[PDB]
Structure 1
Amino acid sequence: AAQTNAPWGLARISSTSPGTSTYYYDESAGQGSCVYVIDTGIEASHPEFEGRAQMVKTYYYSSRDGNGHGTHCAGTVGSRTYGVAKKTQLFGVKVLDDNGSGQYSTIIAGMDFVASDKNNRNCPKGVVASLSLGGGYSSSVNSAAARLQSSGVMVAVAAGNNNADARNYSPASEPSVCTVGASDRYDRRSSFSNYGSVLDIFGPGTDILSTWIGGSTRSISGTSMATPHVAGLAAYLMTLGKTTAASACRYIADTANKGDLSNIPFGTVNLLAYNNYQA
């Protein structure tokens, strides 16, 4: 399948080269997979989600996304126009308030929630969790992400936006999950992207167009935007039977575009998420 005039990041993940604008992907499109977006919520009524999004948990007075960040990330996973996996099921878990903040204890509870809640959902092709969030190093936060991964969920986490080594941030620094840095449309490391040995992969993160609240769209930047590209890619590949939740991060690294990014520090992987789709 071909989507013309796609967001540059979608085009990038199905291309051997930067500078194109058509997204190519197998029409299965993540059907039968599930992606949890652990964030500020999802505006599930947005036409771009086509009924495939729902809120399953909140820790606040509402499950509404009063911020936009979670809706934007969910749109990159699975919206019809802005999403990687355009037929996945999206599940929202609101661990962040409408200012985008959340206590680590709430974030931990949300991760343990997903590990259990997937047993209440139909996801025959597999389960992914996207965590476009983080803070300072916490062994408890990392352990929660490790448990979620161990339970059979492909966990993708943002590396962080500090232009620093991700070893000092959580859940970015948990080794067993998929830690995602950000790149721009010219295949440069995004100026804000964290780096380091713990990164597994880069995805598009500068000037990413996606859904926003109020039934709108906008373009924003962050490792928060790169992470859902990888989460959606995992769901897409799992639907295709190419990999499993336990091995999808490694498979994405194995099949990535290699050596194409600039300003990657010595010791950080030079790997850009790629679906290897041959139309």
Structure 2
Amino acid sequence: AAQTNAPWGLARISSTSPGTSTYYYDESAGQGSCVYVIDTGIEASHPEFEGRAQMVKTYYYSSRDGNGHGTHCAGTVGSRTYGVAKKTQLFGVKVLDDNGSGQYSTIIAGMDFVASDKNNRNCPKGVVASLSLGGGYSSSVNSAAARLQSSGVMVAVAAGNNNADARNYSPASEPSVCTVGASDRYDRRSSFSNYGSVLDIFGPGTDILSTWIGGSTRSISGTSMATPHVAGLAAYLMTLGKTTAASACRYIADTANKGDLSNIPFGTVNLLAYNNYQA
């Protein structure tokens, strides 16, 4: 399948070269997979989600996304126009309030929730969790991310936005999950992207168009935007049978475009997520 005039990040993850605008992907499109977006919520009523999104848990007085961040990330995973995996099922877990903030205890609870709740959902092709959040190092937060991964969920986490080594941030620094840095449309590391040996992969993160609250759309930047590209890619590849939740991060690294990014610090992987799709 081909989507013309796609957001640059979708085109990039289906290309061996920057500078193209069509997204190419197998029409299975992540059908039969599920992606949990652990964030500020998801505006599931957005036309872009086509009934495939639903809120399943909140830790606040409402499950509504009053911020937009979670809706944007969910759109990059799985919205019809802006998403990698256009037929996946999206599940929202609101661990961040409408200011984008959340206590580590709440974030940990949300991760343990997903590890259990996937047993209440029909996801025959596999389960992914996208975590576009983090803060300073916490062994408890890292342990929760490791538990979620060990339970059979492909965990993709944002590296962070401080132009610093991600070893000092959580859950970015947990080795067993998939830690995602950000790139721009000219194949440069995004100016704010964290780096380091803990990174597994880069995805598009600068100027990413996706869904927003109020039935709208906008372009924003962050490792938060790169992470759902990788989460959606994992769901897509799992539906194709090419990998599993336990192996998808390694598979994405194995099949990535290699050596194409600039301003990658020595010791950080030079790997850009790529779907290897051939019509």
Alignment match, 1:192: 192
* CA deviation string 1:24-75 (max 9, x = no partner): 0000000000000000000000000000000000000000000000000000
1:142 positional shift: 0.1
Pairwise CA distance, 1:245: 0.2
1:247 is matched with which residue? 247
TM-fit CA distance, 1:89: 0.0
**Residue 144 of structure 1 corresponds to which residue in structure 2?**
144
The alpha carbon displacement at 1:23 in A equals: 0.1
2:167 alignment partner, SS class: helix
**What's the counterpart of residue 257 of structure 1?**
257
Q: How many Å separate the matches in 2 of 1:130 and 1:165?
A: 21
Q: CA deviation at 1:216?
A: 0.1
Q: SS state of the match for residue 16, structure 2?
A: coil
The structural deviation recorded for 1:16 is 0.2
Equivalent pairs counted in the alignment come to: 279
C-alpha separation between the residues in 2 aligned to 1:16 and 1:110? 36
Equivalent in the alignment of 1:28 = 28
**Matches of 2:139 and 2:202, distance apart in 1:** 24
The alignment's TM-score, normalised by the length of structure 1, stands at 1.00
SS where residue 274 of structure 1 aligns?
A: coil
CA distance in 2, matches of 1:39, 1:146: 18
Tell me by how many angstroms 1:225 deviates: 0.1
How far residue 115 of structure 1 moved from its aligned partner, in angstroms, is 0.1
Q: Distance in 2 between matches of 1:3 and 1:167?
A: 37
**RMSD across aligned C-alpha pairs, in angstroms?**
0.1
Q: 1:180: Cα distance to partner?
A: 0.0
Give the gaps of 5 or more residues in structure 1: none
**TM-score relative to the length of structure 2:** 1.00
Deviation per residue, 1:209-261 (Å, 9 max, x gap)? 00000000000000000000000000000000000000000000000000000
Superposition deviation, residue 195 in structure 1: 0.1
The Cα offsets for residues 92-126 of structure 1, whole Å up to 9 and x where unpaired, read as 00000000000000000000000000000000000
Counterpart of 2:203 in 1: which secondary structure?
strand
Distance 2:34 2:81 in 1: 18
Counterpart CA distance in 1 for 2:269 and 2:54 is: 35
**Whole-Å separation in 2 of the counterparts to 1:206 and 1:217:** 15
Q: CA deviation at 1:175?
A: 0.1
Counterparts of 2:188 and 2:105 in 1: how far apart (Å)? 35
Partner SS state of residue 55, structure 1? strand
Q: Distance in 1 between matches of 2:220 and 2:272?
A: 19
Q: Which residue of structure 1 lines up, in the alignment, with residue 164 of structure 2?
A: 164
Report the CA distance between 1:10 and its aligned residue.
0.0
